[PDB]
Amino acid sequence: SGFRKMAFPSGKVEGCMVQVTCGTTTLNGLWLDDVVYCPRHVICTSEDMLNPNYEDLLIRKSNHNFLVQAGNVQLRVIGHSMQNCVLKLKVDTANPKTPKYKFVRIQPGQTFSVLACYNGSPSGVYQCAMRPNFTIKGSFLNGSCGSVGFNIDYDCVSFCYMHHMELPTGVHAGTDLEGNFYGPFVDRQTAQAAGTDTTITVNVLAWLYAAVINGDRWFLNRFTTTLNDFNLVAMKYNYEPLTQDHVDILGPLSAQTGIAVLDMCASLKELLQNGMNGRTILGSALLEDEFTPFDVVRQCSGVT
Amino acid sequence: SGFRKMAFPSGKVEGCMVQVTCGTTTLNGLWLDDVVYCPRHVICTSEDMLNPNYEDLLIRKSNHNFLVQAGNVQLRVIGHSMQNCVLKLKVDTANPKTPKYKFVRIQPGQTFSVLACYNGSPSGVYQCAMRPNFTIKGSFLNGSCGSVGFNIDYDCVSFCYMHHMELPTGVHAGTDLEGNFYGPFVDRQTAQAAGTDTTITVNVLAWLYAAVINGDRWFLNRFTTTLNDFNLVAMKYNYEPLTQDHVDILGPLSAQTGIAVLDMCASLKELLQNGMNGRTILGSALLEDEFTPFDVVRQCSGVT
Ligand SMILES: *CCC(=O)N(c1ccc(C(C)(C)C)cc1)[C@@H](C(=O)NC)c1cccnc1
Ligand SMILES: *CCC(=O)N(c1ccc(C(C)(C)C)cc1)[C@@H](C(=O)NC)c1cccnc1
């Protein structure tokens, strides 16, 4: 019993973190096999940030200009290339701690763990969700760039995020491991505003199922609804529309609790309309949306 | 910017988790040097749980009755002893991944990370606090016993908790690494009720400082208070009394934000009396108490 915002064990990713320095800029890199991946903005100086031409800035850089340190030992850079917004630094040594891995590009609403690092050293691990506006609400200070987001399936780490920047509103933007930003963001010091941060409806429902499994049942109402009626209310409350695909993925939680997905939607609809009335669900006074249906099943079943 | 419930990187602890089986009971063990630490209730059978006499149950156990598996390889048990509620199984092999470590007994209000494990394999990591009633609100399923709680200071892991059981209310109880339970709990299947789960006042204040540092300032009021006036309100709201020791440890946060500790107490007093009015602080609709002043400083400074 008990339901926590849980991150994946970070050991496999800790074994991949390195420090990357170019000139006077130092950030984090991800060392997998003989390649170190890092944000291309490591090549930017004190003011280049405003309107950088990365191809031009990169012409002035050679392999020896990128300093890669793994632990307290230096790695030899034998090649470098830019792929979208990431630099790939080929080193002469394969990372001996390289886990089985994949690079995946996640969809909004999908959750992942972040290993926040500074100077190639891990400071903490926390669980995030890719927001519907393609930002993440992380905890990142100066020097955290290059910290990565990931999911683990037994022994295979799927890297889905690399931290690049903080928007003027304090929310975060980054890329997949192929260097493509999530959302419309660009790696330059220009004012970039985020769109509406809507609530991930399918994740709230999954978390309401988690609450029922854990004994928190006060919110269960005597009503049902339809997807169309529910979505009219969801739109009004800035919740993402629920599709039949979302209903399908909530099926195992519906089966475990015996609560039809549309009945849980009606309970959620009443929570939106009536508020919590000072009550809490799983120790929260607001509806949590950073647990996917997969996360609820995983945590409630003890997948290792 | 951004403030997250962050756990310590778990790699150093993942390297210590093993599976311990005695008869038909399997739980987790912590392998440090040539000793495997695990809850003594691993020796209890299907019904022994009701009124176990551990000394008597242990007489029927020999070294070969404890099966310790690290990864997919078996460790040889060459000694066993009971220290309070933990068993210490001496093995013939020192754990090659033993980090620098300490065993500490924490006070209520102190936070720590938990690496939840099943069958000696890590499933997730989350941040907890030792509640003022000496329970923890964890996320633990059957087989999670032996999972540990810890803090890290650079390279030294201080182990502070080992999971033993779930109370009938779904809250958790365990011991320090010397086998002494936190609180009055006993390792037996008897109804044991927890005391009042009061709010850790010093931690709420630390988190209100974290919110100011991160731009969440709406709650800052035009008032101040005294420790005695604040505590009259704190007692009324089931908040722990604030001492001058708590004021002293909040000093660095008071200095960074320029907000006197007693002024933050007055803002907290108004939040208690007026409620949040549907507003949020650091994405929460309730006052968070599982961040210590040390955690706020660490996260806001990027300690690795
Ligand atoms: C890792 C660098 C860093 O801390 N940045 C940062 C600075 C500059 C840039 C470019 C404009 C792309 C050259 C990118 C990232 C911080 C930032 O975004 N400042 C505007 C940063 C601070 C806090 C959290 N993440 C990043
Ligand atoms: C790790 C065992 C387990 O899952 N228990 C458990 C069972 C029995 C006992 C004794 C009574 C001391 C012999 C202790 C622990 C669960 C439990 O506490 N059941 C009552 C358990 C379930 C969920 C979370 N933690 C533990």
Number of the ligand 1 atom closest to the C-alpha atom of A138: 24
Q: Residue type for B211, please? A: A
Q: For residue B297, report the distance from its CA to the centre of ligand 1, in Å.
A: 21
Q: Which residues contact B45 (CB under 8 A, 6 or more apart)?
A: B23, B24, B25
CB-CB contact of A139 with A160 (8 Å):
no
Rg of chain B (C-alpha set): 21
B184 contacts chain A (CB < 8 A) = no
**Of A147, A143, A178, A203, nearest to A10 (Cα)?**
A147
What tokens does B222 get?
Answer: 């035009």
Residues in chain A with CB shorter than 8 Å from the CB of B144 are 302
Helix (H, G, I), strand (E, B), or coil: what is residue B206? helix
Q: Residue type for B2, please? A: G
Distance CA A149, CA A132 (A): 17
Q: Which residue has its alpha carbon closest to ligand 1 atom 3? A: A142
Distance CA A83, CA A181 (A): 12
Q: Residue type for B214, please? A: N
Q: Is the CB of A255 under 6 A from ligand 1?
A: no
Distance CA A288, CA A296 (A): 12
CB-CB contact of B287 with B204 (8 Å):
yes
Distance CA B59, CA A257 (A): 43
What tokens does A67 get?
Answer: 């300093």
Residues in chain B with CB shorter than 8 Å from the CB of A138 are 2, 4
CB-CB contact of B19 with B1 (8 Å):
no
Say what the alpha-carbon torsion angle B113, B118, B121, B126 is, to the nearest 10 degrees: -20
Distance CA A155, CA B115 (A): 16
Number of helices (H) and strands (E), helices first, in chain B? 7, 13
CB-CB contact of A136 with A149 (8 Å):
yes
Nearest CA in chain A to B277: A278
Helix (H, G, I), strand (E, B), or coil: what is residue B64? helix
CB-CB contact of B98 with B156 (8 Å):
no
3-state SS of B141-196 is: CCCCCCCEEEEEECCEEEEEEEEEEECCCCCEEEECCCCCECCCCCCCCCCCCCCC
The span from the first CA to the last CA of chain B, in angstroms, equals 17
Residues in chain A with CB shorter than 8 Å from the CB of B207 are none
CB-CB contact of A133 with A194 (8 Å):
yes
3-state SS of chain A is: CCCCCCECCCHHHHCCEEEEEECCEEEEEEEECCEEEEEHHHHCCCCHHHCCCHHHHHHCCCHHHEEEEECCEEECEEEEEEECCEEEEEECCCCCCCCEEEECCCCCCCEEEEEEEECCEEEEEEEEECCCCCCECCCCCCCCCCCEEEEEECCEEEEEEEEEEECCCCCEEEECCCCCECCCCCCCCCCCCCCCCCECHHHHHHHHHHHHHCCCCCCCCCCCCCHHHHHHHHHHCCECCCCHHHHHHHHHHHHHHCCCHHHHHHHHHHHHHHCCCCCCECCECCCCCCCCHHHHHHHHHCCC
- Residue span of the structural domain in which B284 resides: 201-301
Cβ within 8 Å of A, B 42-71: none
Task: Determine the Cα angle at B231 with ends B227 and B234, to 5°.
Answer: 140
Neighbours of B267 (CB within 10 A): 22
What tokens does B138 get?
Answer: 């964890």
Query: Sign of the C-alpha dihedral, residues B253, B257, B263, B267?
Result: negative
Task: Determine the Cα angle at A282 with ends A279 and A284, to 5°.
Answer: 55
Let me know how long chain B is.
304
Q: Which residue has the tokens 């156990």?
A: B61
Residue of B85, B117, B128, B145 marked catalytic: B145
Residue B292 pairs in a beta bridge with none
Distance CA A147, CA A165 (A): 11
Distance CA B116, CA B198 (A): 25
Task: Determine the Cα angle at B76 with ends B73 and B81, to 5°.
Answer: 130
Instruction: Output DSSP code: residue B286.
Output: S
User: For position A248, which CATH number holds?
Assistant: 1.10.1840.10
The span from the first CA to the last CA of chain A, in angstroms, equals 17
Distances (CA, A) of B272 to A228, B122, B238: 39, 39, 11
Distance CA B121, CA B18 (A): 7
Strands B111-118 and B148-153 come out as antiparallel
Provide the annotated active-site residues of A: 41, 145
Task: Determine the Cα angle at B211 with ends B149 and B272, to 5°.
Answer: 90
CB-CB contact of A282 with A210 (8 Å):
yes
**Of A151, A302, A127, nearest to B28 (Cα)?**
A302
Helix (H, G, I), strand (E, B), or coil: what is residue B75? strand
Q: Residue type for B3, please? A: F
**Of B94, B116, B302, nearest to A9 (Cα)?**
B116
CB-CB contact of B84 with B180 (8 Å):
yes
CB-CB contact of A234 with A196 (8 Å):
no
Q: Which residues contact A82 (CB under 8 A, 6 or more apart)?
A: A40, A54, A55, A58, A88, A179
Residues in chain A with CB shorter than 8 Å from the CB of B8 are 124-125
CB-CB contact of B13 with B115 (8 Å):
yes
Distances (CA, A) of B229 to B64, B110, B196, B232: 61, 25, 22, 5
B237 contacts chain A (CB < 8 A) = no
Number of the ligand 1 atom closest to the C-alpha atom of A163: 25
Q: For residue A142, report the distance from its CA to the centre of ligand 1, in Å.
A: 6
Rg of chain A (C-alpha set): 21
**Of B107, B287, B111, B293, nearest to B199 (Cα)?**
B287
Instruction: Output DSSP code: residue B240.
Output: P
Helices within B21-144 (DSSP H only) = 54-59
Distance CA B175, CA B130 (A): 11
Residue A202 pairs in a beta bridge with none
**Of B183, B206, B168, B171, nearest to B133 (Cα)?**
B183
Task: Determine the Cα angle at B218 with ends B214 and B224, to 5°.
Answer: 105
Residue A271 dihedral angles phi and psi, to the nearest 5°: -65, -35
Q: Which residue has the tokens 């930003």?
A: A181
CB-CB contact of B125 with B113 (8 Å):
yes
Q: Which residue has the tokens 């399997």?
A: B26
Cβ within 8 Å of A, B 188-217: 214-215
B145 an active-site residue? yes
Distance CA B41, CA B164 (A): 8
Establish, for the pair of chains A and B, how many residue pairs have beta carbons separated by less than 8 Å: 151
Q: How many Cα atoms within 13 Å fall on the side-chain side of residue B196? A: 9
Distance CA A75, CA A69 (A): 6
B11: left (phi over 0), alpha (psi -120 to 50) or beta: alpha
Q: Which residue has the tokens 């701690």?
A: A97
Burial-class residue B13 by CB neighbours within 10 Å (0-12, 13-18, 19+): buried
Distance CA A206, CA B107 (A): 35
Residue A69 pairs in a beta bridge with A19, A74
Distance CA A125, CA A7 (A): 7
Number of the ligand 2 atom closest to the C-alpha atom of B189: 11
CB-CB contact of A42 with A143 (8 Å):
no
Helices within chain B (DSSP H only) = 11-14, 54-59, 201-213, 227-236, 244-257, 261-274, 293-301
Distance CA B296, CA B213 (A): 10
CB-CB contact of A15 with A97 (8 Å):
yes
Distance CA B138, CA B114 (A): 8
Task: Determine the Cα angle at A272 with ends A271 and A276, to 5°.
Answer: 45
What tokens does A268 get?
Answer: 């959620």
Distance CA A129, CA A102 (A): 19
**Of A214, A212, A175, A190, nearest to A82 (Cα)?**
A175
CB-CB contact of A219 with A281 (8 Å):
yes
Neighbours of B206 (CB within 10 A): 26
Distances (CA, A) of B203 to A154, B173, B264: 35, 21, 12
Distance CA A202, CA B47 (A): 41
Kindly determine whether residue B141 and residue A300, on different chains, have CB atoms separated by under 8 Å.
Answer: yes
Q: How many Cα atoms within 13 Å fall on the side-chain side of residue B37? A: 23
Task: Please name the method used to determine this structure.
Answer: X-ray
Q: Which of A40, A44, A166, A167 to mutate to test the pocket of ligand 1 (most atoms within 8 A of CB)?
A: A166
Sheet holding B86-91, edge to edge: B73-75, B66-70, B17-22, B25-32, B35-39, B86-91, B77-83
